[PDB]
Amino acid sequence: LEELEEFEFKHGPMSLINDAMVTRTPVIISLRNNHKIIARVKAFDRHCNMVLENVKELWTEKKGKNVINRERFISKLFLRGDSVIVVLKTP
Amino acid sequence: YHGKVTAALTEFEANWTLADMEHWLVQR
Amino acid sequence: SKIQVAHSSRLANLIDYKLRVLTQDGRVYIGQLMAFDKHMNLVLNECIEERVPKTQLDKLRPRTTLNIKVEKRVLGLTILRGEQILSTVVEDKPLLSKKERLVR
Amino acid sequence: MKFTPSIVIDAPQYYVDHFNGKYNVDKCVILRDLQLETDSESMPSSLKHLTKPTHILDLTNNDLIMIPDLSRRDDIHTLLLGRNNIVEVDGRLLPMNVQNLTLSNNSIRRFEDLQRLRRAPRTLKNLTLIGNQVCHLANYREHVLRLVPHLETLDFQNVTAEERKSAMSF
Amino acid sequence: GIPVKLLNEAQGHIVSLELTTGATYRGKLVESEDSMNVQLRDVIATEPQGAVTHMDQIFVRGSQIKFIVVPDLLKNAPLF
Amino acid sequence: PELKKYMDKKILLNINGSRKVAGILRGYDIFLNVVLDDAMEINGEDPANNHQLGLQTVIRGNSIISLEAL
Amino acid sequence: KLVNFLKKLRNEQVTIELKNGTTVWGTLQSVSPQMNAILTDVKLTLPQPRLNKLNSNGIAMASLYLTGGQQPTASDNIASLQYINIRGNTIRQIILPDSLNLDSLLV
Amino acid sequence: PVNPKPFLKGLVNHRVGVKLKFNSTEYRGTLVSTDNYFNLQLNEAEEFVAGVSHGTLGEIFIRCNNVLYIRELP
Amino acid sequence: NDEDVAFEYEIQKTPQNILTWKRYIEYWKEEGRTDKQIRWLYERFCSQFVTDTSIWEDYIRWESSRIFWLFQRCLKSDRICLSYLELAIEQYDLAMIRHALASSLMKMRKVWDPVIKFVEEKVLPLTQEAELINVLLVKGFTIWSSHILERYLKVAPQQKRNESLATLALTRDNITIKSVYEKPFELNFNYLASLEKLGLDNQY
RNA sequence: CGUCGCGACCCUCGCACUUGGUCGCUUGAUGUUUCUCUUCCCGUUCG
């Protein structure tokens, strides 16, 4: 069983997340509510659940006919994986 | 008692109401 | 004032407790939990639904001075499907049946 | 007796069906014949222990001189105060959503004792004032009606359209 | 567990069920399945807006059931 | 799906997107996929607005909301 | 995997954020295998701007009010609950304690 | 014939356009790897919303459930 | 605030109704009165019931250094002292752990096995060729562990007698072993060694 | 669109374990779809 998990996280698409975790580089996760999160991956699983460090959350909100950016810094966070649209490797 | 005190053993062992408020509630 | 329940109370302990069950379309179902399921399918006895009408929803905006007049349906013995439950909240504990009042 | 926390906490709570006919759904809290005399330095702070939600509060035959300050209750749609010694009907003190109020056999003696019924919430549908001295007075019913014209029933007799249309003309 | 078994005990009785669409159906439960699929016969249907209509027989997919209302007698069932 | 009682009978399905399809049930599936012969898209009382679909029509089961006899 | 990490956070204060944007501050008491949380001494909240966008947030505001805990008329619609059980599919995020030694929990 | 997974395993190292079922977003990039659950890794990706590019992203991992279709790009 | 007085009058109605005091305490927890205030209320809750220890055990369950101080008081004033045995063992000052436990056995005792391990296992490891001939020639040309072992052997059965004797030997209880043995080869030779080291040559 | 009722004419004589038909609401209130505001007496609350 679990040997397949160690295969898929090493060769398959989640090797990106794994590389970002091992090299400690931040990833720009993009969520289903159009929030971005910029964060370090500390752990993940096959559902793309994640434990994240130094989370910066970013989004726009609207006042009338114009938009104002909003921001949060969260020290430690867990992300349920069903909400992830895309994860981007920060250059 | 757990036996009786003796010095040689002692040294090693040591080197190891309603009335409080009722009347007040009758006037407050 | 309100009911306190022990912190260890899993859903299996809340049988015969009257729950408020909150659901994905903004409605609440209130009834004594008779049984449940791995999915959180629930059986609610003597169930009553409440919803907040669109006329009252405005009163939830910023200015207990708000007084929402919800709309209710008495459903009766009801099975909720698990997909619809967002959350459950305890409203009341198992009461004595009014039979038990009877002196003789 | 007078109001104390154990009295308000221990009080029998049970679901009744009188408002539904089929299902037992209204929690009825019973405080009957209990001879609670009212004391502002003991009662309202005891009533902070009255369980929530509760729907019928039955304070029948108790020695209260005025309607209890349940103004903080959104839930008590029925308040029973029969045979108590209420003398004045301050509509501020009623529950916010009280629908039925039962003042039978109290000690209300003049319309001046009723005048603050005008302040009662517009949710109030049912009133009973039988056996008060006030019920003997001339034009009593028309007075209560123009104080609170949105009653559907007063003294268990239906408020007809002509009674309401009269009362609202003042 | 018990909630689906209760929907087996309701066979032969008039169930009322609401869909995720808001449509309501009320009729005799002639079949039911572990997925909460149901078959209703002699069915009073109702569009989400309240426009009533009537149908001889209907099958409803479990995924789309919001809740099912069951006769009061079954609160006496031996399941509980 | 103990759906066999509908086989080779005409049925009307309400399916996702408030769409409706009518046709002759020729087969069904564990997931409640169905096959319709002589299928038609229904969207009004006017037969000029309803569209005859293809000779065979497979409906993916998670889309079906209800399946009503005719 | 990582639900077995969350199972270690018992008796610790978390801010769960739901899919609909409601934030549940509370003491975490349980996490089922399917991420069903149980929390006590809870404070539900809806972020300020969401109360102005009723086409998206009317359902969220209605579910918050109908919890019966919104006796406070505080802005941002605070509701206080002694106990809540949250179905795991509704969780968006869990904001964890800052002092949590993640390594000892993950390893 | 070519079954879905053999086909997608054939597009690896070729440029594909993954249209998402949401936001009208389509990602155009070189497909590097894919999961049995059809998760995708793209490299050299370009975000397009409604045909207007939001510029090159580098590497992206795209969760399977967001995908409407993958098309090969000639 | 007013609300306390509503419980105070209830205490004046029927002061031995324990549930009144409990609900009063509960309200003071829910609002969060200070520790020094809640201490006064718990001491009232005890003083109105000074004949029964169970309310002291609830107090200790809230006071949980002052919980150790009041526990020393409650041990001075026996099932609660039995409940204290795990806390008392960790003090390691053997007179203070053992005296209250033997008092509880006197007014019964369940510590009789944990303290035995406190002798052979806990105390004893720490309290314990040509060079030998050189030492002997130089001589020629010129007890808490013991008490713990004696206490354990006071009510020990016959099967553990040898073990108790061995523990006494490991505690360097030469005089104690010499006295007790005066009333297996290894025990006899240990008594030999006690006589030989104590300098009782004529008996040796 | 529906729905709670309200009030009149039409059904039943009474001790059990869904009273029935019909008309007005010219409002008695209420929920829900689709299309395109000034002013004067006054009740009650807030800081």
Side-chain angles (χ1 to χ4, degrees), chain A residues 4 8 11-17 32 34 46-48 81-82 84-89, chain H residues 20 22-23 25 27 33-36 39-42 57-63 65-66:
Chain A
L4 182 61
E8 294 280 25
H11 303 160
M14 299 206 78
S15 64
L16 169 56
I17 317 301
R32 282 281 286 268
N34 302 349
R46 58 167 179 269
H47 304 162
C48 306
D82 60 19
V84 179
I85 313 181
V86 185
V87 184
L88 183 160
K89 202 177 71 80
Chain H
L20 305 199
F22 309 129
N23 299 343
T25 51
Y27 295 91
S33 69
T34 187
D35 190 331
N36 282 282
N39 300 310
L40 306 168
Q41 178 188 4
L42 305 189
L57 305 176
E59 294 199 60
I60 60 177
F61 159 95
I62 304 168
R63 246 196 78 101
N65 65 293
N66 304 293

Side-chain angles (χ1 to χ4, degrees), chain D residues 44-153:
Chain D
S45 49
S46 295
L47 294 170
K48 290 188 181 185
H49 306 300
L50 177 64
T51 77
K52 214 276 174 175
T54 195
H55 300 138
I56 304 147
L57 184 70
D58 186 359
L59 272 166
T60 303
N61 189 25
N62 290 288
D63 310 330
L64 287 74
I65 74 179
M66 68 188 77
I67 298 181
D69 182 19
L70 299 164
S71 60
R72 302 306 192 260
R73 300 305 295 227
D74 58 297
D75 55 346
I76 304 176
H77 68 63
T78 298
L79 182 66
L80 311 180
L81 299 167
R83 295 149 61 212
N84 298 8
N85 290 343
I86 277 81
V87 190
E88 202 244 328
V89 182
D90 186 343
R92 290 87 56 75
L93 302 183
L94 290 170
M96 305 200 299
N97 296 317
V98 71
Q99 293 177 1
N100 306 277
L101 177 67
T102 298
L103 301 181
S104 312
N105 310 88
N106 298 159
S107 188
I108 301 163
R109 284 185 295 161
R110 307 83 47 75
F111 308 144
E112 283 65 32
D113 301 329
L114 291 174
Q115 74 188 178
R116 291 199 287 194
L117 180 62
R118 192 198 296 157
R119 313 291 165 82
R122 215 180 190 185
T123 299
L124 184 74
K125 290 301 192 159
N126 226 87
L127 178 61
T128 321
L129 271 164
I130 293 168
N132 287 277
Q133 277 280 11
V134 81
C135 79
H136 301 299
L137 304 184
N139 309 325
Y140 148 74
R141 188 177 173 87
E142 294 75 15
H143 202 292
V144 179
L145 287 169
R146 101 281 295 276
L147 295 175
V148 55
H150 301 298
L151 292 179
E152 288 178 16
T153 329

Side-chain angles (χ1 to χ4, degrees), chain I residues 46-64 88 95:
Chain I
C46 298
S47 301
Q48 191 62 32
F49 299 82
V50 77
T51 49
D52 186 327
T53 67
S54 56
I55 291 165
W56 294 42
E57 297 155 52
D58 288 353
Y59 162 52
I60 270 75
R61 205 186 304 107
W62 174 90
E63 188 69 71
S64 299

